[PDB]
Write an enzyme that holds these catalytic residues in place. Structure first.
Site, PDB file in Angstrom:
ATOM      1  N   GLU A  11       0.836  -1.225   0.000  1.00 35.27           N
ATOM      2  CA  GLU A  11       0.000   0.000   0.000  1.00 35.27           C
ATOM      3  C   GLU A  11       0.862   1.263   0.000  1.00 35.27           C
ATOM      4  OE1 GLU A  11      -0.886  -0.547   4.823  1.00 35.27           O
ATOM      5  OE2 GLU A  11      -2.543   0.160   3.493  1.00 35.27           O
TER       6      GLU A  11
ATOM      7  N   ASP B  44      -4.271   4.056   1.536  1.00 32.04           N
ATOM      8  CA  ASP B  44      -2.827   4.333   1.709  1.00 32.04           C
ATOM      9  C   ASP B  44      -2.182   4.356   0.320  1.00 32.04           C
ATOM     10  OD1 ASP B  44      -2.000   4.834   4.439  1.00 32.04           O
ATOM     11  OD2 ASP B  44      -2.808   2.829   4.879  1.00 32.04           O
TER      12      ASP B  44
HETATM   13 CO   LIG Z   1      -3.912   1.058   4.755  1.00 37.95          CO
END
Ligand SMILES: [Co+2]
Ligand SMILES: [Ca+2]
Ligand SMILES: [Ca+2]
Ligand SMILES: [Co+2]
Ligand SMILES: [Co+2]
Ligand SMILES: [Co+2]
Ligand SMILES: [Co+2]
Ligand SMILES: [Co+2]
Lengths: 253, 253, 253, 253, 253, 253
Positions: E151, E177
């Site tokens: 991420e 993210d």
């Molecule tokens: Co995350």
């Protein structure tokens, strides 16, 4: 008020202290253990579901009783050590210590500046009774006891170096972690592991440090006591609760 | 989802169920007890420091295990009975029941209107799994089990009248409260008390109700089981924890 | 500081207030509900696992938001009412009120002596902000709102008498308890029950009191609002959480 | 282990005991108060957001310190009195006592059968330290202290009758409740109220009972002590916290 | 007792498992989610206010239900991983994994010595049911499932290296993210981000690992399921609670 | 809903803000402090027994009041900073900052990618009110305030370098830690320490950063305010509670 005297620390040099592991993670259960008369109670912040706040509740329960509290943090984390000292834990047991460098950092973690790195916040700390112990910042260091665990091959590879660290009051052997590290996971009773444990106790005491261990096996615990081991934990509250309830049911199946 | 079957209630007519008293007042301790294999666990809201929220935590812990939960409220309080039923207690043990009128009120307290007075709030209740048990309001009453305690002279003075109350599934004898009421406080083992307990068990079973009792004395518990007693609690978690820790320390003093 | 104005109480005479039932029994969940914009939030101490301490946490969460808090105690218990008023609940909903005598006792339970029986402890109470509201004991009574539930045949048998009680600000109809009392448990939507609910709303408003009700059925809630009903709860947090999660899973089975 | 001696109870006959009200409802805050050196600490279950479990935490915190704990339940409720005695409260303060019949019931509520009605569950009780106090059921009653509050017109109307109850160890005057009952709500300092308070103290002591009172007014507290009042609370933790923080801010505005 | 079988781990190779994110941080809310029928529930220790003790409460609630628990720790912290395994989490989701070296350390963190570095404390662990699972130390490793999150750009820069780590059972993509890392914060739905997510899922599955993702967008979740993604979380309890309450209020404004 | 404006952050440039240290570690105690009128309240996660969950309770209590909350984590731990930001803390005070490299990492820890490393989980965060603040991910960074503590010799050795870090909004001097580091433990009032503190305040303000400090000494606090110090904490709740209770008892001994 005068600072709480650390009788556990003094008795490392004068007697053999019998311990009970406290992993029921609760102020009420800790008080039940505190009534029994153990020399020391180990509030386990590594292998029981404890945090700073639940450890505080247990220190408050135990404080009315003569049993000395020892706290084990989840690891040798300097800020966590700071938090456990300020709630008033006077003896710490640091798991998985593996070098003299790490042991020296744990010594400094338990002592105020300028000689150590313990964060200073006496106005807020149960340790100082919120400055009702008026000379706490001068008298605190003297009553703090640092125990480190040797329970890995790397710890055994650095044993002589850890034993030369001034400020390490005791070395405690972890048979579960050590037997697993040695490739005998779940079989600490094997001669290969026990011969290493006995040699390790003898080396700890020869270097003038206190030796400690946990064994729920009565024969092994008595053998360790015969060898002079200074702090011996002889059982675990979760284990005793489970076994007592199982043994009772077995009478009625 | 189908309503949780009350196996404790069914087994009152088919077997002798072995119980453990749970007074450690904690979800973690209740789970340890749940792993042992007792037929029933008594979550004590009368003599352990429990409230609706701590009882809920223990019901949630125990629910993954075959042990049947029985809850004792602090008294025969109709609104508290409502609260304990909605968090999903299916068997209640009412202390200090002393008349057929009080027993009949406890029956109504456990049943929905129009036949009873149990407050209706299935949208909010763990008992209905928040209406995920789609027919809960039709199926709930069938799986509720009402136990009442006879443990005073007035209780014994109304025994035959209590035993004629439809909806009382079982009568449990409290030896501590009963021996104290009889002027033998701390001495339930006296023949005067035990002859009354045996006579009372015989009358309970003769009236077609389940008989119950607690005794941590293995000989008395086995005697009660020989007499046919349907639900026998054979120990107490707080007692077993304290005794197991004391017996261990005595091996090392 | 001036006493917190009870806008819920004022708005009983000026608008129709939309409510959400809060039975998730937690300060964090209560705050989520407080962000939505409901006119009122009902913290349920009758059918959700709440106590004085968990209700306090929820009042503290909700207090930063314009939603007005209403608390339902487990029953019309005078000492519990005292406890809920001192943690700062300004509107109470009393379940299962069945007589003008009981309603009058609930009025006195919410008012200070000498006119009422509310226990006096302003130094300790969040209600007075620990006397930081300097004139609390003179200004408290004016901002307290008493709601009573009619939700049994006896309540309906005493409706006209309850509606003549000065100090009853509102009568709330409980369709679950009322449909069960009428022998239609789980079937409040039946015409027999709905005709009684509509007649009851009309009588409440004709006597100059505020009428209230809960219905998770959008059509019924809108009908009650068309009839002028002053405080209408339109759903329940536990129900919405369960249904939202089920509806989502059903898209993927 | 011997039963915990109730020094508060003994000192009712030998000295004047200075008290602090504890309404911060928390084990950590109770410990701070316990370090100061008050003769007694009042854990308030009536006007602070406390329950059996939070009162237990506070008893555990305070137990390490010489300050004697007194617990005030929310009302003279027999089952709640049983719960508070079992968690180990040895002195109870019952609010709003208004007859000799109610005072006699409170006496019985604090004593074991057969002479009283205290429920018997020593195996589960911190009070017996889970039977580690081996003779608890024989020695308990001697160390229990019953205090009742006179703080209403009906209490004053029954004062002479309450003062003739054997087992009432002390009568405590509640100035907030009493001044409100007299139609001087928020104005206990008025001569009409104070003349009644002084006359009431004189009558309590003339009947050979201990007299008690709370006043945060230093002049009034010192006057009550000059009159011989045996147990005087001189302040409240919530009030001292708020005033200390306000006084400090005022130096910097 | 036999070790709890990790059905989530087995089903990574046999079906597509539908998940619900649990961030209400409470045993009661987790139980509501457990009743719905999700294949897995993610107890979020990274983005919900959880700690070891609140995660334990939720594991205990969920354990009575077929839904498999997955726990996300706040970071890939070896001692915290030890704590979560001992309270009995059998599947872990490690956020922000960015190298094969870090992934290999997470593998070792989940396995006992001598092959891994998981601390050994089976006497104290719910994971072993306090050694009621008699062969736990031999059978534990087999039922532990390690999931790592890719991420970040550095994660994508090390994807092929992470996918060659034996012991990584699954790679989960974090769209929030990841979109932020790519300079599309709050806009994961952009084609630039989605083309990277699809390519990444394809590479994960081509390397013989399970792919996972969360999307509250029904169209994207269904697209990910069409692509073969093995573990797909389709919503979040906090989000569903807020949206369900807002949608209801909007019908009445 | 618009993001909560950080008035503390704005007022660093327009006025001198008076602070109270909050170490009673409890939502109820934090609310008492919030009623007083301090410009800022410091919720201490370093020297009081707080965790993410107890800090959340305190943010929820304080949120209804104009006092601005500042949170001190136990150390400059990136994942803990993420957790405190998500529960909605908008101003952080990082203890023991000792380099520009560490200060720059703390800046990134408080900002979203791609410019920073704050983990993204707005669906679960009180900070976004669970996305009820619809533009949170665009507006969050602007309202976050980073304060770092200089309170060691190494911090003073890197002061000019820390003061050149963009994103450090304020430097706070810790007199307890600094006096200990300087070999004057418990004696911060010595001229050697005070001359360093005054010089450090002057340098912080000369670099255009806000300066801060705590002193319970009224004279020192007033001197720091005369020097232009932007954020001055003037006392500590635990200290004020203890001293107020001791001063009262001393009037009666
Ligand atoms: Co995350
Ligand atoms: Ca409670
Ligand atoms: Ca915690
Ligand atoms: Co170990
Ligand atoms: Co009994
Ligand atoms: Co109802
Ligand atoms: Co009073
Ligand atoms: Co500092």
């Amino acid at each position: 008020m005068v600072n709480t005297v650390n009788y556990f620390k003094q008795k490392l040099k004068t007697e053999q202290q019998i311990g009970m592991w406290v992993g029921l993670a609760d102020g009420y259960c800790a008080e039940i253990a505190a009534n029994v008369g153990y020399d020391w109670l180990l509030i386990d912040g590594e292998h029981a579901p404890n945090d700073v706040r639940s450890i505080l509740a247990q220190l408050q329960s135990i404080a009315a009783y003569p049993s000395q509290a020892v706290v084990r943090p989840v690891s040798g984390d300097v800020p966590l050590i700071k938090q456990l000292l300020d709630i008033g834990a006077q003896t710490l047991l640091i798991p998985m210590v593996e070098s003299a460098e790490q042991a020296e950092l744990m010594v400094k973690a338990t002592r105020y500046p300028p000689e150590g790195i313990r964060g200073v916040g006496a106005a807020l700390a149960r340790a100082s009774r919120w400055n009702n112990i008026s000379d706490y910042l001068q008298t605190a260091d003297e009553q703090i006891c640092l125990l480190v665990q040797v329970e890995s091959k790397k710890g055994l590879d650095n044993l002589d170096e850890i034993l030369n660290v001034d400020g390490v009051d005791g070395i405690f052997i972890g048979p579960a972690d050590l037997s697993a590290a040695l490739g005998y996971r779940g079989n600490p009773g094997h001669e290969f592991v026990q011969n290493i444990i006995v040699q390790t106790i003898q080396k700890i005491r020869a270097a003038g440090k206190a030796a400690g261990i946990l064994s729920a096996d009565e024969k092994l615990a008595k053998q360790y006591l015969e060898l002079g081991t200074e702090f011996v934990a002889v059982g675990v509250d979760t284990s005793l609760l489970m076994k007592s309830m199982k043994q009772l049911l077995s009478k009625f199946k």
